[PDB]
Ligand binder design. Structure first.
Ligand SMILES: [Mg+2]
Ligand SMILES: [Zn+2]
Ligand SMILES: [Zn+2]
Lengths: 383, 180, 56, 104, 83, 171, 79, 112, 55
DNA sequence: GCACAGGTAAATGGTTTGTGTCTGCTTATCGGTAGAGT
RNA sequence: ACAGAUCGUGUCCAUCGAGAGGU
DNA sequence: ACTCTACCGATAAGCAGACATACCTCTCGATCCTGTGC
């Protein structure tokens, strides 16, 4: 390191428990130094000096230019710092040095920031787009990986067969640019990567950058099953906690009920009804999956329900469901109501619940969610 | 199924200090000063060939007696030994229990001590030295004639025991195994 | 309680009407109030539009 | 709308009623209302996923032809009133159909 | 780390605890677990769970986790239900 | 060589079995589970001693279903073939590859390349064995064999044996 | 309810994670009932977790970014 | 004094629309904003620059920067927040998840 | 291409060209068609002054 | 007879009404003492 | 020795931009 | 005593970075070729 524990300022800086703050302090204290010392006076008796043990060579002023680092060597030489020498220097860093700098000797070494073996994502990460008519449209990641492979092969052949240093430099620059665009297509001060279509290529950073990303668009927010949405309307004859569910929605949405001695007859009657009338069932689940369809098999009636099975019955009356309006600002925008089947294709609610919902009947749209387990049903009813 | 939590950077130790060795270097699970369920800092228990057979036999008869009392409350030499543990195993453990037969047969065939007093005094005799209980179990189980056999049998006893004391307790064990 | 507090603070923000002007008393100082004032308070702006001081 | 678009030279789609014998991965909608030419005559009530235009494309085991029919919309139904057949600029077949419904 | 004489938590039973206990009992009853009370002809697992909670016949233990990591165990029958 | 360790086991019990007999249900579950096990870490489990104060802790209920997870504490006799350990057994099988040993419940193999060239496969004798000089070895005879190492940590557990050592064979 | 909506009513995936590496690169063969981790030749500690498919895709993308999101089933504290 | 002034300013902000907000919410907000020794703005340069988990932090602002920072360092995410459990698809330790439910043998044999 | 996609320019560099110049005619109602045929748009992209009704 | 494979195009010069509000990096600029005399 | 026409279940047409909308 | 010039701190002022409520509905286009081959 440029500075060690001998310096009082360095000793004071090497006391912050936080890694980021300690690294920032070390960088601020060491960026001023531009030459190895090798002879640091001791804290006590400043007249006598102590051999630090360094090299004594001067340090350059590293400057970032595009994807390359340049160094103004002045005692001015302007030599571009190669990646190989930087990696070699990083490999020579002692464990304590980057431990104090913030890096961990087990999980993230400083020398591991240099790419020497790039893994490729599996086909699930970059699937094949079927697209209308039989054409094998491929993801941009596959094209970028193929480009990187081609650049690597070209560089290897150019190095093996013998070529001037300019060809090696341009090949390695092209490979570095392609790798960087594969990992980040929004590099500042650099031209974007364009394919044959002329549009900017899609990078994984661009894949997860905003509210359409993997985290803000597929992790904390996602599409769900067993949900419905239709125009709401008023009904003074309904109760305060009651929602008018259309017959079609009730026949579509289903709730899985485990067959029990207390409801065996009811479940058998619902199964015999079939997925045509509202008080019916759509699916019968036996042991170890093996779903049974009640609308294609038609084998209903001659099927005996054994204990432990599951029956996907239609949404019946007094079923607790979640009723939501967007935007959901406060917790009152989410409420649990009781299902009441109505003979019209609209949502009916009491007039007194419109104020917490902040909704009217001029064309509003509201969503309905049903639970799929006893845990969720009970907690929705009681909370 | 484990009894020790992660420690000393077990996630990415990246040392790979082999798997086992004759000169100590025991496995991590079988390490000195084990952790008891309620206590702590308890050393590893090592059982000789004779001690283990007595332990399993006593556990089996205890389980059989417990089962018999529950049912009631609800309502030679080597040849003779084989019948005894056969009739003990045929009803106590139950199930397939195929593996248990071979272990018990090997214990009975290779048993060194058959007297309760002798095996009990074995620990009292061996407690004089501070040797690791594994090697004392090895010398108690394996036969010997003098110091050369004990030294050649295992490589974990290099200059760890004085020859005079070694030959002394080797002859002690020799007579304690020849008296029965 | 944190989510409840956040919702209870943000709901009146959406429910408020225009808050760009009309915040003047005896002297038309155009004191900032409402949504812009709340935004500059949350962002902790070092240069507010209408700094003020009261002396007793 | 549908078109008899051509791939290469010999890979040209055709308008005909598909059959189970030589069509693979075909839709499960009803094909009874279709005619020999592959179009529904005007005045026939349609509903659900019923196929209105029957088009098949050559694959290149048999099953040399694969269907490309466009079914009616799931939430739409009615009676077909006008069916228009013509040719595009290059010389292929152009087919347009219309569905009429009353919304009380 | 399970003190008994130094239990500083409230003896009352929270709404979240009540909802969780009722849901767990209802789910167990639905999946054919033994019932320790008579049903009076009832056939809905949730109401059976409420009936069991009424007379404190639910064999469950609440483990309240302190922020540091310690915890204390409260029985359902010993928790006062007032809400 | 025999050790006793305070092992731990995790089991899941269906709530349909949540009766007064849960303790004995878990007891028999453990009893048939750890008996005859061939775990690659602990080794061979032979007997489960100390059938008292098992101390079955409270069973945490998984949020997904009504099942409860139990962490039972128990001690049992273990058996692991430590590498480099001298053991004594009996010969069971003897092919042209070598003669096997019956140390405990294992099938330790003394491959032909381990013991010296003195031992020869003489098929003339009625029991196929390796009759040679320096004492007589046959099927079901006393033999002391060392362990070179542990292989096949998964599924069955066994090792490889050798006789090329002073004061190791014959006996 | 939040967990049910995020998992049961949406993507739900089961993966095997090595107990040493902490990554999901575990070779699982359910037919022969055996598992292996070629990274650290581990065969006697394999755990299965239930995570959404989006989380698995994000972790795989992060691994493609030379970033290791190691997942562990135990709490690391004290020693 | 700064916290009190901030609370007074917020109360004056919510004063003209006629809406009334309980003191607890605004007090909690100003205490969070002044937990450290200075003002903590509600932005990417304020409460973001904290010691909380990277997964829960990176779900609001730009993500790949903090992910790269986490990769460069070796910080441990305790996964005790809500965002981490939502990402991992597990029951967050909030509300009904703040406790654990266990079954006892003594009470089980007590009833029957 | 310009009259179909609505991007006023050549096939390439369409990202830097204006969009929405050409739109499909709205024929839901005669009044709607008349309104669509007499529509003007100022490309601006936060600012309240340009949106205000000037004197 | 028709297909087959690399990114050889523009050099340029060039663009656009009216986006603020912090954030960090990199200079330029301003005082203030220390190696000592006649 | 033995040594098959398809059958039977079959999965969808996607992505990127642009415009018009309505609470 | 302050000249001949060095690092300390304390600002000004230009250079870029991040991002803008939520819900869904519908239609409409585009996803390559020209110099080069015998
Ligand atoms: Mg409205
Ligand atoms: Zn140096
Ligand atoms: Zn591993």
């Amino acid at each position: 390191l440029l500075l060690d524990e001998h310096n009082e300022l360095m000793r004071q800086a090497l006391a912050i428990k936080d890694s980021k703050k300690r690294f920032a302090a070390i960088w601020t204290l060491c960026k001023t130094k531009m030459v190895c010392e090798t002879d640091v006076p001791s804290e006590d008796d400043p007249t006598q000096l102590v051999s630090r043990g360094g090299c004594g060579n001067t340090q350059p002023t590293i400057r970032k230019d595009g994807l390359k680092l340049v160094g103004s060597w002045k005692k001015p030489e302007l030599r571009v710092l190669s990646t190989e020498e930087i990696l070699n220097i990083f490999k020579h860093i002692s464990v304590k040095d980057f431990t104090s700098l913030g890096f961990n000797e087990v999980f993230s070494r400083p020398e591991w920031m240099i790419l020497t073996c790039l893994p490729v994502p599996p086909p699930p990460v970059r699937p094949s787009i079927s697209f209308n008519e039989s054409q094998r449209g491929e993801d941009d990641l596959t094209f970028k990986l193929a480009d990187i492979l081609k650049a690597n092969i070209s560089l290897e052949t150019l190095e093996h067969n013998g070529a001037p240093h300019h060809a090696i430099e341009e090949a390695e620059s092209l490979l570095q640019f392609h790798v960087a665009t594969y990992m980040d297509n929004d590099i500042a001060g650099q031209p974007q990567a364009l394919q044959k279509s002329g549009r900017p290529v899609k990078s994984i950073r661009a894949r997860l950058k905003g509210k359409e990303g993997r985290i803000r668009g597929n992790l904390m927010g996602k599409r769900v099953d067993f949900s419905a949405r239709t125009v709401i309307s008023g009904d003074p004859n309904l109760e305060l906690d009651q929602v008018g569910v259309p017959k079609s929605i009730a026949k579509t949405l289903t709730y899985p009920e485990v067959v029990t001695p207390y409801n065996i007859d009811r479940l058998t009657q619902l199964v015999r009804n079939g997925p045509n009338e509202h008080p019916g069932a759509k699916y019968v689940i036996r042991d170890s999956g093996d779903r049974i369809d009640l609308r294609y098999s038609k084998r209903a009636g001659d099927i005996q329900l054994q204990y432990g099975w599951k029956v996907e019955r239609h949404i019946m009356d007094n079923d607790p469901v979640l009723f939501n309006r967007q935007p959901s600002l406060h917790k009152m925008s989410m409420m649990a109501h009781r299902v009441k089947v109505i003979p019209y294709s609209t949502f009916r609610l009491n007039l007194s619940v419109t104020s917490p919902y902040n909704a009217d009947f001029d064309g509003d749209e509201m969503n309905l969610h049903v639970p799929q387990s006893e845990e969720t049903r009970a907690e929705l009813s009681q909370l | 199924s484990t009894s020790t939590f992660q420690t000393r950077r077990r996630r990415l130790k990246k040392v790979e200090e082999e798997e086992n060795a004759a000169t100590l270097q025991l496995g991590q699970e079988f390490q000195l000063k084990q952790i008891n369920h309620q206590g702590e800092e308890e050393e590893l228990i090592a059982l000789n060939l004779s001690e283990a057979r007595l332990v399993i036999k006593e556990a089996l008869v205890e389980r059989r007696r417990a089962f018999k009392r529950s049912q009631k409350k609800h309502k030679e030499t080597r040849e003779k030994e084989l019948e005894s543990i056969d009739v003990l195993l045929e009803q106590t453990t139950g199930g397939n229990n195929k593996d248990l037969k071979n272990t018990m047969q090997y214990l009975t065939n290779f048993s060194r001590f058959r007297d309760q007093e002798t095996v009990g005094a074995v620990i009292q005799l061996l407690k004089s030295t501070g040797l690791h209980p594994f090697e004392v179990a090895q010398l108690g189980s394996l036969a010997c004639d003098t110091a050369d056999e004990a030294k050649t049998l295992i490589p974990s006893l290099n200059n760890k025991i004085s020859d005079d004391e070694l030959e002394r307790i080797l002859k002690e064990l020799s007579n304690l195994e020849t008296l029965y | 309680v944190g989510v409840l507090a956040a919702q209870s603070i943000g709901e009146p923000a959406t429910q408020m009407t225009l808050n760009t002007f009309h915040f003047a008393g005896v002297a038309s100082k155009k004191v900032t109030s409402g949504v812009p004032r709340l935004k500059e308070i949350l962002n902790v702006a070092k240069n507010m539009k209408t700094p003020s001081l009261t002396v007793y | 709308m549908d078109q008899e678009k051509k791939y290469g030279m010999s890979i040209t789609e055709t308008f005909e009623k598909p059959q189970r014998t030589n069509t693979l991965r075909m839709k499960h909608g009803t094909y009874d209302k279709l005619d020999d030419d592959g179009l529904i005559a005007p005045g026939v009530r349609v509903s659900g996923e019923d196929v209105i235009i029957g088009k098949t494309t050559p694959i290149s085991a048999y099953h040399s032809k694969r269907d490309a029919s466009t079914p009616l919309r799931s939430t739409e139904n009615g009676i077909v009133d006008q069916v228009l057949v013509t040719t595009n600029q290059d010389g292929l077949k152009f087919v347009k159909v219309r569905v009429r419904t009353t919304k009380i | 780390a399970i003190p008994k004489d130094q239990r500083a938590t409230t003896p009352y039973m929270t709404k979240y605890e009540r909802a969780r206990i009722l849901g767990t009992r209802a789910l167990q009853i639905s999946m054919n677990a033994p019932v320790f009370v008579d049903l009076e002809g009832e056939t809905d697992p949730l109401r059976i769970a409420m009936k069991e909670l009424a007379e404190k016949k639910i064999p469950l233990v609440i483990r309240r986790y302190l922020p540091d990591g310690s915890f204390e165990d409260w029985s359902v029958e010993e928790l006062i239900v007032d809400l | 060589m025999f050790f006793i360790k305070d092992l731990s086991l995790n089991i899941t019990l269906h709530p349909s079995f949540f009766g007064p007999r849960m303790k004995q249900y878990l007891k028999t579950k453990l009893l048939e589970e750890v008996e005859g096990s061939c775990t690659g870490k602990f080794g061979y489990i032979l007997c489960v001693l100390d059938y008292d104060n098992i101390d079955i802790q409270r069973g945490r209920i998984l949020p997904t279903d009504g099942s409860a997870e139990f962490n039972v504490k128990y001690r049992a006799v273990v058996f692991k073939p430590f590498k480099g350990e001298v053991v004594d057994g009996t010969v069971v099988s003897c092919s042209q590859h070598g003669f096997e040993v019956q140390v405990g419940p294992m099938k330790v193999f003394v491959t032909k390349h381990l013991m010296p060239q003195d031992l020869t496969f003489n098929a003339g004798s009625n029991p196929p064995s390796y009759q040679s000089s320096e004492d007589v070895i046959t099927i079901k005879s006393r033999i002391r064999v060392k362990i070179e190492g542990c292989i096949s940590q998964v599924s069955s557990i066994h090792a490889i044996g050798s006789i090329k050592e002073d004061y190791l064979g014959a006996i | 309810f939040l967990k049910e909506r995020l998992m049961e009513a949406s993507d739900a995936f089961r993966v095997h994670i090595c107990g040493i590496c902490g990554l999901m690169t575990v070779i699982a063969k359910l037919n022969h009932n055996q598992f292996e981790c070629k990274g650290c030749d581990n065969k006697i500690d394999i755990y299965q977790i239930h995570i959404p498919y989006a989380a698995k895709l994000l972790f795989q993308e992060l691994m493609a970014m030379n970033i290791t999101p190691r997942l562990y089933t135990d709490r690391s504290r004290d020693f | 004094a700064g916290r009190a002034a901030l609370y007074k300013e917020v109360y004056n902000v919510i004063a003209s629309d006629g809406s009334y907000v309980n003191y607890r919410h605004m007090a909690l907000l100003v205490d969070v904003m002044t937990t450290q020794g200075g003002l903590t703005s509600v932005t990417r340069h304020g409460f973001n620059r904290s010691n909380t988990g990277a997964l829960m932090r990176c779900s609001f602002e730009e993500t790949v920067e903090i992910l790269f920072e986490a990769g460069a360092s070796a910080e441990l995410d305790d996964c005790r927040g809500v965002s981490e459990n939502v990402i991992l698809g597990q029951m967050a330790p909030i509300g009904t998840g703040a406790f654990d439910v266990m079954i006892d043998e003594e009470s089980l044999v007590k009833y029957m | 291409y310009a009259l179909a996609t609505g991007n006023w320019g050549e096939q390439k560099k369409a990202m830097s060209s204006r969009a929405g110049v050409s739109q499909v005619l709205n024929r839901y109602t005669y009044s709607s068609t008349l309104s669509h045929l007499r529509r003007t748009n100022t490309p601006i992209g936060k600012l309240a002054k340009p949106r205000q009704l000037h004197n």
